[PDB]
Design a protein around this ligand. Structure first.
Ligand SMILES: Cc1cc2nc3c(=O)[nH]c(=O)nc-3n(C[C@H](O)[C@H](O)[C@H](O)COP(=O)(O)OP(=O)(O)OC[C@H]3O[C@@H](n4cnc5c(N)ncnc54)[C@H](O)[C@@H]3O)c2cc1C
Ligand SMILES: Cc1cc2nc3c(=O)[nH]c(=O)nc-3n(C[C@H](O)[C@H](O)[C@H](O)COP(=O)(O)OP(=O)(O)OC[C@H]3O[C@@H](n4cnc5c(N)ncnc54)[C@H](O)[C@@H]3O)c2cc1C
Ligand SMILES: O=c1ccn([C@@H]2O[C@H](COP(=O)(O)OP(=O)(O)O[C@H]3O[C@H](CO)[C@@H](O)[C@H](O)[C@H]3O)[C@@H](O)[C@H]2O)c(=O)[nH]1
Ligand SMILES: O=c1ccn([C@@H]2O[C@H](COP(=O)(O)OP(=O)(O)O[C@H]3O[C@H](CO)[C@@H](O)[C@H](O)[C@H]3O)[C@@H](O)[C@H]2O)c(=O)[nH]1
Ligand code: NA
Ligand code: NA
Lengths: 386, 386
């Protein structure tokens, strides 16, 4: 046949499943993608005026402690030695971040040793027992105290969720967000970096295989009857929206979206760092990204007098908006269980598997999407494609 | 013969010359080393109570932009992804360091953008023109201004040199010590790390070759007549003290030394970072090293409740003291030129080559010693050993 497997969507989940089927099982794979490009939200492109690599669906930082995933992705791109670090802007000062000896010194006014900082945090957080916390605000305070909470957590959290933290689940915070050393590596994973030649080259390399066909600007729901009629026995891996697949018969699942305001400025350097969080309520955006600093190794390709920045705004996703983060209200959770039952039945009757962020209503980092795809490949697809 | 080449001293210079002769030319090499161990001042060992790797002749951080050197050293050890970062303690606060947007924010009280910081530094340093500076103090001020100079440079410099900075050469500072971003990577080199299994294993691996013989606890000057009589034609590479070699006939070259006060403390973490500079005159030491943080990858081998620190003191090297840094007074420079003429004559008459830190009265980082040895090998020894 012209294809043995159909993959709907070319995000990291779809790309991984397609590439494994193509290279490991020698199967012909047809990837159907609704957008004008590969890669889903991880896709990046050159900003036209400066040439700087930017993102239109959020900044993407790759990090993992999963060696299998790391070895896998390095087949398709090399990674720089980039390490993500973040600064937090509060009341006109850029704080070291996450919370640690650095921020603590800056905020409380003098140097605290590791042991002194431990003592300080116990004093500050004595007010509420975490076992007694009834919401996010209390849970935060019970861990780090009011001054730190009110300075670095309250408004940022309020902006991201568009909710007062007194109305958010105590379960949103599950561990002490404080380090008792000067380590401000943002992520804690064994492996970390950025694709040496950008995300677009990486994701394009994954789909670059003699056994893989890609059709861009193509909506699955507009072509599915025709495609499946060409080879009825070919299974489908669907990574589009789960609720949309079943005509919203159980309601619309709720998502958070993001707005990005991207500007080219007439300076070579706007903030001297890739990411600056804006922790104060007076700034409507949560953070500013300055894209050139994600790739300092490209400096003599970047302009000396211009830079691209991007302000990030969070809100509830309405019709038209890109769905990014599942909200997971108990209503959402309940119509999700209903959709899982429909999906499971569809797999049994129609050989349609459901995966990825949209297909399963679950936020997935890139390495988690890849791991999830590798698992579906191993445990489901190898058998379905015999 | 039993040896084709004699190398005096097993620092990185000697080890490199010995290993190249052994492996590239297939020559028998005898290394004579006065101390009880290999590796010179780069040698490290386990502290007995904690097991933590420590140094007795200074902390050693490996970094280079020389790819040949990098490829070379990686034949003998793997390196961790350690990146050196330093903090500067001033008036009870730990500052981000070197001078950059971080320190500037902390010191001047609010956030300065890259362009604002550039403007600030021009205002601060307007007082003196660097072309008009007559000493170190003025040269420093002409670059960064009095407040920064007096906070972070004056006393530290005074402690290291045991001299008032008004009495030091304007030539000691040659570039703007200020970064206009938040990058606090301490070194600027392409390659950086620490030997995965410690320096002792690395340096021992270099000398581990079927063609290499090592005699520890052996002073060249006590054995040289006997050794050379066994094979008169074998050249010598001498990396011992240059002035001592010629019986101080032209005077004693002046060196700076260091005292180290090493303590085991009953806490798991003393300062939460590998190196804390003490910039204030009230502390007699220049900095404290906390050795466990050079190898965070070894954390579950390190004790949870103990840590080794080391305070560093600088002074002029007297009889007995380990000579570490050449002072280079014009007197020194003049008796050095005299010694260079003697050395050059000795090479011609006795086939004794002079190299390394002590052999040439010049401070050398590890990669610079290696490069210098590789060069002596290439340009001198290959011909001398035919
Ligand atoms: C704002 C944001 C920031 C992120 N930052 C990071 C980060 O820093 N680090 C990290 O590891 N991960 C990050 N991620 C996650 C990362 O993008 C994952 O790769 C992804 O979210 C999950 O994998 P996926 O393939 O299922 O999803 P997707 O990327 O959503 O891919 C699904 C694809 O299916 C296509 N599709 C949908 N419906 C149809 C249809 N009917 N027909 C055809 N095609 C269709 C879509 O157009 C899309 O290309 C971020 C995600 C977002 C949204
Ligand atoms: C305090 C300090 C800190 C340093 N920190 C760093 C750092 O962070 N990064 C970096 O890259 N470099 C650092 N270095 C430099 C590093 O140690 C170099 O490897 C070295 O200084 C230069 O190489 P070398 O082989 O000539 O010297 P050495 O290390 O001095 O080796 C010379 C050897 O010759 C031996 N010897 C002397 N006389 C005789 C004799 N008569 N007979 C036999 N043997 C003899 C000595 O015992 C010694 O083992 C530091 C050095 C010091 C002193
Ligand atoms: O300055 C800050 C930063 C974070 N938070 C709190 O932490 C939460 C998470 O903050 P966010 O900025 O989204 O952190 P990220 O590390 O960027 O997390 C997202 O993006 C990561 C990219 O890899 C993923 O690992 C995570 O799963 C995903 O939630 C927020 O909602 C707040 O409650 C603050 O209060 N203040
Ligand atoms: O907090 C500080 C640090 C440095 N200095 C000035 O900078 C000079 C150098 O300081 P130092 O602490 O010795 O810097 P290092 O980077 O440790 O330099 C030594 O050790 C490095 C280890 O790789 C080598 O690269 C260098 O050549 C060697 O001089 C001092 O004398 C001061 O004049 C200050 O004023 N304040
Ligand atoms: Na508490
Ligand atoms: Na000036």
């Amino acid at each position: 046949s012209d294809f043995d497997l159909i993959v709907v969507g070319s995000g990291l989940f779809g790309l991984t499943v397609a590439e494994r089927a193509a290279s490991q099982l020698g199967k012909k794979v047809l990837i159907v993608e609704k957008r004008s490009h590969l890669g889903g939200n991880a896709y990046s492109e050159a900003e036209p005026e400066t040439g700087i690599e930017i993102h239109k669906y959020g900044a993407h930082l790759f990090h993992t402690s999963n060696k299998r995933v790391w070895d896998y992705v390095n087949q398709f791109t090399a990674f720089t030695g980039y390490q993500h670090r973040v600064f937090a802007m509060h009341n006109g000062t850029a704080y070291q971040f996450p919370m640690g000896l650095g921020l603590i010194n800056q905020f409380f006014g003098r140097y605290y040793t590791p042991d002194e900082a431990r003592e300080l945090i116990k004093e500050q957080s004595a007010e509420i027992d975490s076992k007694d916390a009834t919401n996010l605000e209390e849970k935060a305070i019970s861990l780090i105290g009011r001054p730190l909470y009110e300075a670095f957590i309250r408004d940022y959290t309020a902006k991201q969720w568009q909710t007062d933290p007194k109305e958010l689940p105590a379960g949103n915070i599950t561990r002490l967000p404080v380090r008792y050393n000067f380590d401000n590596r943002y992520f804690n994973d064994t492996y970390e970096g950025l694709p040496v030649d950008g995300y677009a080259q990486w994701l394009s390399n994954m789909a670059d295989h003699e056994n893989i066909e890609v059709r861009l600007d193509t909506d699955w729901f507009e072509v599915r009857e025709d495609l499946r009629a060409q080879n009825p026995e070919a299974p489908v891996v669907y990574t589009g929206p789960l609720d949309r697949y079943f005509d919203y018969s159980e309601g619309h699942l709720g998502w958070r979206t993001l707005d990005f305001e991207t500007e080219v400025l007439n300076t070579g350097d706007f903030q001297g760092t890739p990411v600056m969080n804006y922790n104060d309520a007076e700034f409507p955006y949560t953070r500013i990204h300055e894209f050139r600093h994600f790739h300092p190794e490209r400096e003599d390709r970047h302009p000396k007098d211009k830079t691209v920045i991007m302000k990030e705004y969070s809100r509830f996703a309405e019709e038209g908006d890109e769905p990014y983060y599942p909200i997971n209200t108990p209503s959402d959770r309940e119509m999700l269980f209903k959709y899982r039952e429909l999906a499971d039945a569809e797999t049994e009757s129609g050989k349609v598997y459901f995966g990825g962020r949209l297909g399963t209503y679950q936020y997935l980092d890139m390495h988690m999407a890849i791991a999830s795809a590798l698992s579906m490949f191993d445990n489901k697809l190898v058998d379905a494609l015999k």
